[PDB]
């Protein structure tokens with residue numbers, strides 16, 4: 029009517045290596061002044077036909093808007109398409125240069141990147157989180173009519189390079205989908221983090237969607253599971269309980285706990301081990317055998333406050349600071365005083381709720397010699413100092429224990445990575461809905477990458493983390509380490 033905005037070119041989103049992920053592409057939008065269109069009714073049917081619109085629906089739309097001075101006819105046409113309609117010389121019909129987003133990697137990085145709405149505003153993912161950086165500033169065209177000027181130029185948005193490595197993202201996406209098909213699972217997540225920089229190198233969820241064509245789309249495919257699915261992490265948090273034990277000054281890895289007969293009565297409750305073939309276990313054995321009894325006895329000795337503190341410091345149930353739309357925090361209840369039942373359940377991971385992103389970040393702190401670096405979804409050039417949350421001595425010790433969980437007899441052999449020493453822990457998460465988990469990092473002797481694999485479980489009162497998720501970790505870690513040119517560390521001493 030008086031002012032019409034001049035859309036600004038929205039900033040390009042690339043992966044960390046400059047591969048295109050969200051591109052602002054010029055498109056031609058047609059608009060009309062219904063007051064002038066109302067004087068040329070005989071041209072409407074050819075215009076409706078050129079637009080592929082029903083003659084009656086098109087005429088009713090003009091008639092109902094007869095007193096308006098601006099209505100869109102069609103948005104997002106190619107420059108070639110706009111020219112053909114303009115050549116008809118229909119009174120009151122005008123072409124406007126607009127920008128429309130295209131997502132070259134499509135479904136492979138759908139949830140991380142997100143998308144823009146009809147007006148080119150960030151709606152999901154990075155598009156929304158970094159909307160101010162990406163959007164730039166629109167210009168203005170003053171239109172004066174009976175009873176055109178450029179006022180303020182358009183400024184383009186800014187390019188953004190994500191932390192995601194499209195090569196690792198594609199490998200993760202492919203392997204997670206393979207694993208889901210193999211096990212008859214319908215949903216899952218896989219997160220890969222650079223332990224040194226806090227960068228999220230890959231974040232894939234299944235099911236996924238093509239952001240280039242969002243009509244039809246089931247809302248389950250829209251779910252950014254890695255950041256929104258909250259669950260009790262179970263056995264995957266035992267390394268944090270062990271970190272508290274080694275930091276207490278009361279436990280060395282060679283110390284023994286008698287877990288026989290794989291049950292422990294605490295008043296009215298019975299703590300039970302899934303695998304009940306042990307008597308004395310050292311601290312590494314407690315992790316290899318995933319003994320709830322062993323971890324609970326240690327937890328009683330050191331107190332739940334020490335375990336709570338380690339979990340809180342590594343970020344379990346805490347804000348990530350990413351500012352990512354829809355990201356959930358979960359909950360790590362600070363009971364202040366914990367009875368035995370609550371102490372045990374916390375120690376073996378059923379007394380808190382976390383996300384896959386949080387679990388990966390906690391494993392990244394352990395892998396990075398106990399130093400937590402803040403999470404980033406954008407490329408990190410200057411690494412922040414981070415915080416020493418676990419002492420380097422304790423983190424080094426727990427790293428060795430987790431390498432034994434993968435490599436020792438009776439360990440999670442399916443998680444072994446050929447050419448490298450790998451470390452990690454399997455578990456069954458609870459939401460009752462279940463998930464099979466594997467969390468770990470590699471190379472075990474000089475860690476570079478941390479990864480969490482979550483596969484949603486149809487299940488039957490079973491524990492499949494070491495069967496379903498561990499092989500995904502093996503394949504994705506091997507490919508990721510090779511893609512990053514990490515030297516193999518399993519060499520003759």
Ligand SMILES: *C(=O)[C@H]([C@@H](C)O)[C@H]1CC(SCCNC=N)=C(C(=O)O)N1
Nearest residue numbers: 262263302303318454455456491493
């Ligand atoms: C952890 O998630 C549970 C805990 C809460 O009971 C455990 C039980 C099992 S399965 C038997 C493993 N024993 C030795 N080979 C696991 C696991 O995934 O290893 N975690």
